[PDB]
């Protein structure tokens, strides 16, 4: 595993002969392979299992290195590549164009909001799903029909509205079974696994819950909205009513905690008990989702797309949007007024800096820590900044030459210590 | 006892049994609401600054006293109880002072 310095610098050897972007993609892949070796093969029994978990956490640093390279690649590919330069055709619209064409336009025109979406797509890519068929969440929740226990045992109407309508009905077993469903649908919604959430809602027998998921999509008619001509019309033309109805349904108690939370994620609002177990990536996702859902609605309002009748609960919804900067600052604080331990992590601070777009600010600032005798403790962090700077200058002439020399010099000194003579000498 | 920053921890526990400054050495907002004295409030504001609720801090600064934005923030604070009513009255008084004025009139409206 000492031959890890080879794999990154081997990705360097191919790059004088070839092209820039595959270097970052290979850095994602190289770190990904290294996660697996450290992670595998480790067996934990009793007390050691904890030791194995600690080992995984250390590798966990390599996992974080893979996720960070993926994010770096995704954002720089949007920012530098010709994907931000195109005809304004997506934004050429008329009042008769549907609310969906208006969202397609907003995402094309607003690069800043679209960058938030690329971060969301990344956070969804690295989400933890519970298992279907190898955990009690869905394997043991394979009940043939919905509310079989409450139907078979008394203790009037099958519909989900019957227990919101009146007190006590549901059997404890059916509530326990619903907890597993909604938790698993909720993990899938966080993972962006919307199609799987719909497939499960249909197969579990929950056609009503499936219908709520369908109301994500805005109305598109292919006939009127010729830009994205599909074949059938799709989505719901009163999305604001649907958003408010979903928000109201989220607030209502006597529903499961996981259900209220899916409705909160759909409404672009926060949830409460489920966020107690929300990690940094998970909290970043929920808060960016609020920012996207508020921004889209404000553009829809400014365009005059929304109808006054659909405004059932304006007073209950946050009209304001926070900036990406405030998103990270609020997420960075702990609930107990401490620096968040996850935010303070050396590679997580970089993820945020790549999202803000001030990458080069930390690259100069980090180099100052080397002269001040800091960073040396984390063996990965010194390497990371080296490869990251090398990648920045190849894609765009960016980081200061002074910083490149200081970072490369300290990195080459390490190659002699690790005795990587052919590569260290070259650096 | 061997030096550690355990003095604040012990002092805080004693206060709970029977204060805010000792804790410093949501709740702060509640304290401000109770204190809808002035020097103590200033000290609390300084502590908040050291900690840095930002909107609440801005409101406190306004009370101690771009302008339109500040007025909007004050309105938001008013939007979000007898103590609350008193705070609203104080905000109205502040608006009157500001008027003493089209923006002020709008705030009054």
């Amino acid at each position: 595993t000492m031959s890890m310095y080879p794999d990154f610098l081997k990705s360097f050897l191919e790059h004088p002969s070839s092209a820039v972007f595959e270097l970052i993609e290979q850095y994602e892949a190289t770190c990904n392979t290294q996660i697996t070796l450290l992670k595998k093969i480790v067996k934990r029994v009793t007390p050691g299992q904890q030791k194995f978990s600690k080992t995984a956490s250390i590798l966990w640093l390599l996992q974080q290195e893979m996720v960070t390279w993926r994010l770096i690649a995704a954002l720089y590919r949007d920012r530098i590549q010709s994907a931000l330069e195109e005809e304004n055709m997506f934004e050429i619209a008329a009042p008769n164009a549907s609310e969906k064409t208006i969202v397609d336009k907003l995402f094309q025109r607003d690069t800043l909001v679209r960058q938030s979406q690329l971060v969301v797509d990344w956070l969804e890519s690295i989400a933890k799903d519970e298992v279907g068929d190898f955990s009690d969440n869905i394997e043991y929740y394979a009940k043939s029909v919905y509310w079989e226990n409450t139907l078979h045992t008394l203790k009037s109407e099958l519909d989900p509205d019957a227990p919101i309508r009146q007190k006590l009905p549901l059997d404890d077993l059916d509530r326990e079974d619903d907890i597993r469903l909604l938790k698993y649908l909720f993990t899938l919604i966080r993972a962006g696994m919307t199609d799987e959430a719909q497939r499960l809602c249909k197969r579990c027998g929950q056609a009503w819950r499936a219908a709520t998921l369908e109301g994500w999509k805005l109305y598109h008619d292919a006939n009127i909205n010729g830009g994205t001509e599909l074949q059938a019309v799709e989505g719901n033309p009163y999305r604001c009513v649907w958003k408010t109805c979903c928000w109201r349904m989220a607030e209502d108690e006597q529903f499961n905690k996981y259900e209220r939370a899916i409705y909160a994620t759909l409404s672009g609002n926060l949830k409460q008990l489920l966020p107690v177990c929300e990690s940094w990536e998970d909290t970043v996702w929920a808060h960016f989702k609020v920012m996207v859902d508020s921004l889209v609605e404000q553009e829809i309002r400014a365009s005059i797309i929304s109808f006054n009748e659909a405004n059932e609960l304006p007073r209950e919804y946050l009209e304001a949007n926070w900036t990406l900067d405030s998103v990270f600052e609020e997420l960075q604080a702990t609930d107990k007024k401490r620096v968040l331990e996850e935010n303070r992590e050396h590679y997580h601070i970089i993820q945020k800096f790549v999202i803000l777009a001030d990458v080069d600010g930390l690259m100069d600032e980090f180099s100052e820590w080397l002269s001040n005798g800091k960073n040396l403790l984390l063996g990965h962090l010194l390497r990371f900044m080296t490869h990251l700077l090398l990648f920045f200058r190849t894609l765009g002439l960016q980081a200061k030459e002074e910083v490149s020399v200081e970072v490369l010099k300290t990195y080459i000194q390490r190659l002699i210590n690790e005795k990587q003579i052919e590569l260290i000498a070259f650096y | 006892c061997v030096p550690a920053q355990w003095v604040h921890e012990a002092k805080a526990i004693r206060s709970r049994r029977d204060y805010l400054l000792k804790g410093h050495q949501k709740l702060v907002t509640r304290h401000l609401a109770a204190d809808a004295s002035f020097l103590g409030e200033l000290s609390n504001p300084e502590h908040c600054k050291h900690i840095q609720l930002d909107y609440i801090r801005v409101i406190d600064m306004l009370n101690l006293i771009g302008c339109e934005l500040e007025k909007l923030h004050t309105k938001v604070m008013s939007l979000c109880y007898t103590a609350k009513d008193r705070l609203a009255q104080s905000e109205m008084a502040k608006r009157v002072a500001n008027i003493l004025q089209p923006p002020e009139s709008m705030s009054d409206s």
Partner: protein, 169 residues
């Protein structure tokens, strides 16, 4: 698009900044009339960065820098989305608070460092330093040595003209 302006006219009659703004959008798709519509919409309420900039651009080119400050000041302090910046600082410079605004603007924006120096030049050693700071590009180095010439620094200027001059030729 004519049906769309009928439904806009009717809505306005019924009650409506977003109608009046929409009319402006239709106009963008008879500029004086559109500008008038934008002005009315702005008066009714404050909405979208595209509203604020269409009115503020109309007033800016009408020469009415007091109306353009009014829009852009409300669009900043309302908190909808201010990043007008040119007309505000420029307006302050024309007027001859302003220093604070300049500092805020400064907080690698070149023309902004330039307008800042010129404000300081209406409100000598500090001025000389300003040029030295900017210079730390041949034409930078050349205006730097020319205004050193003005302040009276013959020894420094000939070294820092010649240094440039055989960095460029």
């Amino acid at each position: 698009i004519q049906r769309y302006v009928e439904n806009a006219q009717n809505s306005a009659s019924s009650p409506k900044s977003m109608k009046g703004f929409l009319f402006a959008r239709l106009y963008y798709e008879e500029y004086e009339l559109a500008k008038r519509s934008v002005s009315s919409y702005i008066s009714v309420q404050e909405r979208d960065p595209k509203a604020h900039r269409f009115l503020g651009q109309l007033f800016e080119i009408e020469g009415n820098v007091e109306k353009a400050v009014g829009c852009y000041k409300r669009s900043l302090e309302l908190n909808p989305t201010q990043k007008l910046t040119l007309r505000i600082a420029e307006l302050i410079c024309t007027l001859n608070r302003a220093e604070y605004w300049v500092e805020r603007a400064s907080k690698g924006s070149p023309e902004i460092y330039r307008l800042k120096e010129q404000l300081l030049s209406s409100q000598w050693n500090q001025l000389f330093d300003l040029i030295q700071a900017e210079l730390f590009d041949v034409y930078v180095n050349l205006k730097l040595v020319d205004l050193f010439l003005s302040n009276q620094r013959l020894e420094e200027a000939v070294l820092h003209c010649l240094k440039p001059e055989r960095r460029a030729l």
